[PDB]
Amino acid sequence: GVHVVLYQPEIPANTGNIARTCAATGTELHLIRPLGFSTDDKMLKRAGLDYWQHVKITYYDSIEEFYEKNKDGEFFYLTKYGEKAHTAFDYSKREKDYYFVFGRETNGLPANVIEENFDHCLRIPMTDKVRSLNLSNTAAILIYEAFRQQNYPGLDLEI
Amino acid sequence: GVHVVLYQPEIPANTGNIARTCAATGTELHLIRPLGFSTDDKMLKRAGLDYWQHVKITYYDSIEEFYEKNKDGEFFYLTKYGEKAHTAFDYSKREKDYYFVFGRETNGLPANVIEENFDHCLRIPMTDKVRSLNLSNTAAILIYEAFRQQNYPGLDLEI
Numbered sequence: 545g546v547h548v549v550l551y552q553p554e555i556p557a558n559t560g561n562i563a564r565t566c567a568a569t570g571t572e573l574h575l576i577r578p579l580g581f582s583t584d585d586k587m588l589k590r591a592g593l594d595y596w597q598h599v600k601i602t603y604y605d606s607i608e609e610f611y612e613k614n615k616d617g618e619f620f621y622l623t624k625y626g627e628k629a630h631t632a633f634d635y636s637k638r639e640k641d642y643y644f645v646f647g648r649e650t651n652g653l654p655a656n657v658i659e660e661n662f663d664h665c666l667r668i669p670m671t672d673k674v675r676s677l678n679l680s681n682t683a684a685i686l687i688y689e690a691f692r693q694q695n696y697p698g699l700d701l702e703i
Numbered sequence: 704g705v706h707v708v709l710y711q712p713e714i715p716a717n718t719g720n721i722a723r724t725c726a727a728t729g730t731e732l733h734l735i736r737p738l739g740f741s742t743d744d745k746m747l748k749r750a751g752l753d754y755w756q757h758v759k760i761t762y763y764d765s766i767e768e769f770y771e772k773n774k775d776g777e778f779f780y781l782t783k784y785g786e787k788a789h790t791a792f793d794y795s796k797r798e799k800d801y802y803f804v805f806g807r808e809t810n811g812l813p814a815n816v817i818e819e820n821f822d823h824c825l826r827i828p829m830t831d832k833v834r835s836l837n838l839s840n841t842a843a844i845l846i847y848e849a850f851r852q853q854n855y856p857g858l859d860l861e862i
């Protein structure tokens with residue numbers, strides 16, 4: 545499968561957007577606490593996030609716990625410090641588990657995570673006119689790059 | 704070049720995100736009024752959009768005006784009602800002008816626009832668990848699909 549991992553996300557609208565993209569694709573959502581916001585059920589529903597119930601979601605109290613519970617698979621780390629493009633790897637094997645790990649809107653990923661995993665750090669190409677892309681936009685780009693390579697498994701090409 | 708055209712966008716954060724992706728790539732931003740928010744220079748500064756100045760932006764009072772001022776190029780219309788994938792077309796020619804036209808967060812694209820241009824209506828594939836993707840996410844996906852096909856011209860220069 546395809547997986548998005550959010551390391552300590554900050555801003556509720558970004559995670560709401562990412563959860564929508566996950567519901568839209570069958571991508572799993574992994575949230576590493578602390579979060580910057582509540583995800584209580586009654587609040588999500590009155591906020592009209594009806595799609596949230598359809599997301600395959602897992603919460604973790606630490607990135608250590610995340611790793612322990614997700615030992616198998618291919619792990620990629622999205623960071624502007626990466627020296628490979630997000631499109632440089634093959635995500636076409638539907639039977640594999642691909643994990644794309646994203647940093648905080650403000651802090652990004654911890655430096656040691658980037659350093660320990662540098663040959664799997666991916667930079668979406670940019671001009672020098674911004675420091676970074678929006679978190680939810682980067683998750684949407686990576687999700688649909690993987691699904692493009694897999695020829696859209698489980699998705700409706702037409703209504 | 705690559706162009707994103709927003710038909711009467713509603714939510715300031717979506718247009719802020721799309722402007723960020725445009726500054727990040729050199730994609731032109733075309734805004735068809737009425738907009739749902741102020742884009743006065745003083746409001747954008749109050750909102751902290753430091754990259755806005757770098758965006759190649761044009762405003763129009765109508766889609767008719769937009770068409771009159773952009774006669775040459777290839778026009779694609781992003782809608783869940785499309786019957787071709789966003790990846791089904793060739794955007795690889797850097798000398799051509801590719802325009803991707805997006806609808807409103809609430810009403811989408813006008814029915815007559817979809818009908819009249821149906822052969823070039825593009826649907827990003829989705830499951831049945833959501834009605835649509837987030838507007839800014841869809842723009843980011845299309846921008847980076849076009850730049851992928853062109854091998855990221857003008858990006859990652861002198862990082």
Ligand SMILES: Nc1ncnc2c1ncn2[C@@H]1O[C@H](CSCC[C@H](N)C(=O)O)[C@@H](O)[C@H]1O
Pocket residue numbers: 621622623624645646647648649650651652653666667668669670675676677678679682
């Ligand atoms: N160009 C890009 N390439 C890869 N990931 C990106 C990206 N822009 C944003 N992201 C992702 O979005 C997250 C939040 S943006 C954080 C940016 C960072 N704090 C800075 O120095 O500006 C990042 O941690 C990364 O996972």
Ligand SMILES: Nc1ncnc2c1ncn2[C@@H]1O[C@H](CSCC[C@H](N)C(=O)O)[C@@H](O)[C@H]1O
Pocket residue numbers: 780781782783804805806807808809810811812825826827828829834835836837838841
């Ligand atoms: N799956 C998808 N394929 C193509 N465009 C999409 C899309 N999801 C969202 N969009 C774009 O994002 C815009 C705003 S989403 C608006 C849709 C409307 N609220 C509804 O319930 O259906 C759309 O007009 C379209 O341009």
